[PDB]
Structures are given as C-alpha cells and as structure tokens.
Amino acid sequence: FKNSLFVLPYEQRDALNSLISGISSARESVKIAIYSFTHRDIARAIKSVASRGIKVQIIYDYESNHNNKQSTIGYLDKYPNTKVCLLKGLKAKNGNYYGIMNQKVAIIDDKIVFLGSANWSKNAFENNYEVLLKTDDTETILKAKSYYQKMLESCVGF
Amino acid sequence: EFKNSLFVLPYEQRDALNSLISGISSARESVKIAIYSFTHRDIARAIKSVASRGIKVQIIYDYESNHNNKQSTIGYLDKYPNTKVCLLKGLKAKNGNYYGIMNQKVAIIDDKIVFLGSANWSKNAFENNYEVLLKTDDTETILKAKSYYQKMLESCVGF
Ligand SMILES: [Cl-]
C-alpha cells in the first residue's frame, strides 16, 4: 500500500491532476462527500465518467448547497448515473444549530480514497494552503465505504 | 509498511479527539501544527501540557481567521514556553484582489505521526460535524509534511 501526500499550493497542479485522474479512471463507482464544490474542471471529470456508465453519488453540505448558485449540485443533479443529495450535521450541544457536513472525501471503486483539507474550488487548488492525501490502503477504503453508506441515511433530495 | 488510522466523525468523534490529544500529549520531541481554525480549549491545554515538559511546539494559524479573534487560541498560546505561534495568508488570486487562506488542519508529532483531514480544532468539529481525521505513521508522508512545513514556517508572520 501507498499514501501519496500533496501539500498545496506547492503541489496544487499535481494534486488536482491526481484527483481528476482518479475520478476519470473509475471503473464502477465514485462516492464523494464534499462541503463546497464549485470547481468546474472537477465537475467535468465527474460528468465524463458518469457518461461511461459509472455510478456517482455526491453528498453535499446542506446549509451551504441547498440554495447556492455557485454549487455544482444544480449542474450535476440531472445527470445520468449521478445521485446528489444534501446532509446536515448533527443537532448541536451549544445552540439550536446543526453542524455541518465538512468532509472532503472521494472514494473510487474499491481502490482509492482521497481526503484532506481541500474544498473542490479554484480557491483551494490555486490560492490556498491545503493537504490532499490519496491512499490505496484497503482497511482505510473499507472503513470509508462503510461509513459513507451510513451517512447516506441522513441525506436528502436536491 | 504503515498504519493508517481513519476516524469518521461524528460516529467516532470521541476516539478522534482522544487520538489527537493523546498524540500531542505524549510527544517526546516536537509538535508541528498548521491549523485554519483552532478554538478548542482542551486541545490548547494539551499543547501547554506538553510544552511544559520541554517539547518544542510550532503552530501556523490562518491569518484572517486568527489575527484578531478572541475565540482563537493564538493569544492563549503565544508567549507560552517552548511555543512559537505565527500567521499565514494564502496566495494572491490570479484574477482577483484577494488572498487565499491557510486551510490545512495538520499535526506532525516528533518524526512519528501525522494527523490530517477535514476537522478544524473546534468543539463544532469534534461534536456536531461530519468530518474525517486520519492518523498515519507512514514515514514518506511524515518526511514530506515536515519538509513543506519548514517552507510554510518561512512564509508565516508574527502574531
Ligand atoms: Cl474546511
């Protein structure tokens, strides 16, 4: 097994290329959980692999994507083999507020998981300090796939 | 060979916090941190606790989030023994008159552990949010995180 760390902005070109190549070369499934997802090269890699027949699921943060014209959620909602939904975080202990869905995770087939600090935005891949980790570690992948299904429980239609 | 430990929050939020807190607390040499938002007082106390034992701690905070924020831990940790705090803004946007952010949430412990993932160091993240937190001892990842950490440290500015 291999971990491939990308430290942005230093490695921002390689990081975006790695994420786009991982989504585009999927054979079966792409499962994504993302807080913010505005980036149009990445939405086109999704659109491209869904057109090859791959099943894509995308969980977006509810508060920040349910009515947000810069989110790709509107753009991808209609798309063949592509299921998008919205997830709120848990009821808080502080106030009457709900948490956020702040993950930035992509799971490709049974083969690769991407995680780290980067939202899917031009800002993240051009202007920010960030970290993106790609891993083929099977135990990592299995746990991520298991909890992704669990999350899907609580997610709702766009 | 290495061990990835993934925590998926909120399901594993207490195990996640406890892993991170234990990783910092038991450091024997150094703690290197780059964090976007850091308001969680128990994690700050854990930093104080280990800095009190003579471990060197360095913390890069996001500049806009931390330069003037009473809920930030930067003020609480600034002049603490063995503790270096500083601020870092991102790059200028190619077609805008604004700068990026320092959005990493990373802790490097000795040469032995790196913690990375989505979670800001807040009660919000450890109590209410979906997040992921990954612990690894993979030495290639650790060396690389250390190398760029040093480069980051040369761009950060005083608090
Ligand atoms: Cl974030």
Residue numbers in the entry:
A (entry chain B): -1 to 156
B (entry chain A): -2 to 156
Paper excerpt:
Hp0323 (NucT) encodes a nuclease from Helicobacter pylori belonging to the endonuclease PLD sub-family. So far, NucT has been implicated both in the process of natural transformation and in the purine salvage pathway. The family is defined by the “HxK(x)4D(x)6GSxN” sequence signature where the histidine is proposed to act in all PLD enzymes as a nucleophile in a phosphodiester bond cleavage.
The active site of NucT and of its homologues is carried by the loops that link its seven-stranded β-sheet, itself surrounded on one side by 5 α-helices and on the other side by one long α-helix. The HxK(x)4D(x)6GSxN signature of NucT is perfectly superimposable with the catalytic centers of Nuc and Zucchini. NucT formed dimers in the crystal, a feature in common with all the PLD superfamily members described so far. The active site, twinned by the dimerization, is nested in the hollow of its dimer interface, surrounded by two small helices and long loops (orange in Fig 5A). The substrate specificity of NucT (i.e. single-stranded vs double-stranded nucleic acids) could then be determined by the restriction of the accessibility of the active site due to the two negative patches. While the short loops present in Nuc and Zuc are acidic (pI 4.2 and 5.7 respectively), the extra loop in NucT carries a strong positive charge, with a local pI close to 10. Thus, the NucT loop might contribute to attract the DNA into the electrostatic groove of the dimer, resulting in the higher affinity for the ssDNA when compared to Zuc.
